[PDB]
Design a protein around this ligand. Structure first.
Ligand code: HEM
Length: 441
């Protein structure tokens, strides 16, 4: 009933413990040491870090806890606004945008984004087909060029043309710089400029679209046409802008990190790569994959879920208690007390997964309804879960499937995993060589 806590440093409390490049990975070692819940304090603040399915299932009870805006999210809000990711559940625009957008993010909706997803996936595979013998691939870098450009095209029909450039489109530069400044806060002049570069481009495209009247297969058209069933109101132009920024911010690096970790685990486990490659070769019989083919990539799906089990690329989310309540019969909480769910630790809960938790075994997702409620949460929880989940999994299944169909991969550096932490996680410096199977594309 007395909650563990790691080392304090006077008035600085535990804060110096995350004054490090890799705070979630430091927080996992502390979980390893102290167990399923520990208190963590800074000058401003108190949270409790949760690591076990037993406690997290309670934290995921939406009658008892709701999403909290962590410090990270309030810093992101300076450019993400009241878009879905940085809004309180009780803010009017959270519910309006959630109701309007949800069906545009369904699995069914992926049929309409599929062609533009393919457009960028084909650009990626064609870059790699075109590398000379003496060349290798920078994996998180290329995955991020892919995911940015795909979210740009599917979100607002805009081409960042990241595969035509060494220096990204200036929106991307400002967005990436803005996100890093927001994360480093846990400069001011550049932050305002980068905010402006983002709103100006996105405002222009929205203003251009309303001018022309064109209908496209993008999220911007759906938002210009949507009406919230409850209020009957549409989203206004400002909020629509924030949502577009938000899809880019929330979706670019979580998804590129997933594709990166997945390829990492595959090159480190050749038997698994071979099984995935055999599926890809049997399923993707056409030079351009179809929507239906991507759905038939079951083992690729399992690969991605196993990568998400080990390194969920948005590894922590924050909750607050709605009312006074007792967690797990042992830990009294007050209204407003904060919890943090440490997803990498949840995903290593031996009582759910067995003792082999560090092993990469996609067969553990063979039968996805075996997995107990709230044991596997890379996309967060309940109504505040990732609205992008189907878009992310469709994108990654499509792209990994193509990669595995078109190339053999060599881990030519015997890469050693080094996980860089920002808002998200990625295997920094991961590189491979890809030898083409010379299959038509
Ligand atoms: C594998 C890739 C992804 C992962 C692991 C992921 C993870 C998450 C998680 C954990 C949350 C909950 C955040 C919290 O509780 O504070 C979240 C929310 C969200 N994500 Fe994702 N995300 C991914 C891809 C994407 C994509 C591609 C998009 C957009 C196209 C996206 C858009 C959003 C939005 C808008 C929210 C806020 C939803 C709401 O609260 O209404 N995400 N994501």
């Amino acid at each position: 009933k007395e909650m563990p806590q790691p080392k304090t440093f006077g008035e600085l409390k535990n804060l110096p413990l995350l004054n490090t490049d890799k705070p979630v990975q430091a927080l996992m070692k502390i979980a390893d040491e102290l167990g399923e819940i520990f208190k963590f304090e800074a000058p401003g603040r108190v949270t409790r870090y949760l690591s076990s399915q037993r406690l997290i299932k309670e934290a995921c009870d939406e009658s008892r806890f709701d999403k909290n805006l962590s410090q990270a999210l309030k810093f992101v809000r300076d450019f993400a606004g009241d878009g879905l990711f940085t809004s309180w559940t009780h803010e009017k625009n959270w519910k309006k945008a959630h109701n309007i957008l949800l069906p545009s993010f369904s699995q069914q909706a992926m049929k309409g984004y599929h062609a533009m997803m393919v457009d960028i996936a084909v650009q990626l595979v064609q870059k790699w087909e075109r590398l000379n013998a003496d060349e290798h691939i920078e994996v998180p870098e290329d995955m991020t060029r892919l995911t940015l450009d795909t979210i740009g095209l599917c979100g607002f029909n805009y081409r960042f043309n990241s595969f035509y450039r060494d220096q990204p489109h200036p929106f991307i530069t400002s967005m990436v710089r803005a996100l890093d400044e927001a994360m480093n806060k846990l400069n001011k002049r550049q932050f305002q400029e980068d905010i402006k570069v983002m709103n100006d481009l996105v405002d222009k495209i929205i203003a251009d679209r309303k001018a022309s009247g064109e209908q496209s297969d993008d999220l911007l058209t759906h938002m210009l046409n949507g009406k919230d069933p409850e209020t009957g109101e549409p989203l206004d132009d400002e909020n629509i802008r924030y949502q577009i920024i938000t899809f880019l911010i929330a979706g670019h690096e979580t998804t590129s990190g997933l594709l990166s970790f997945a390829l990492y685990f595959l090159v480190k486990n050749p038997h698994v790569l071979q099984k995935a490659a055999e599926e890809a070769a049997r399923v993707l019989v056409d030079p351009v994959p179809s929507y239906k083919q991507v759905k038939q990539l079951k083992y690729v799906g399992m690969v991605l879920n196993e990568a998400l089990r080990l390194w969920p690329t948005a590894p922590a989310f924050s909750l607050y208690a709605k009312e006074d309540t007792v967690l797990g019969g042992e830990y009294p909480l007050e209204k407003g007390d904060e919890l943090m769910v440490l997803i990498p630790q949840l995903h290593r809960d031996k009582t759910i997964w067995g003792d082999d938790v560090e092993e990469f075994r996609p067969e553990r997702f063979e039968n996805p309804s075996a997995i107990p409620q709230h044991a596997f949460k890379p996309f967060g929880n309940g109504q505040r879960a990732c609205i992008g989940k189907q878009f992310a999994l469709h994108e990654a299944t499509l792209v990994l499937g193509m990669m595995l169909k078109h190339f053999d991969f060599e881990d030519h550096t015997n890469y050693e995993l080094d996980i860089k932490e920002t808002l998200t996680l990625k295997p920094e410096g991961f590189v491979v060589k890809a030898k083409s199977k010379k299959i038509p594309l």
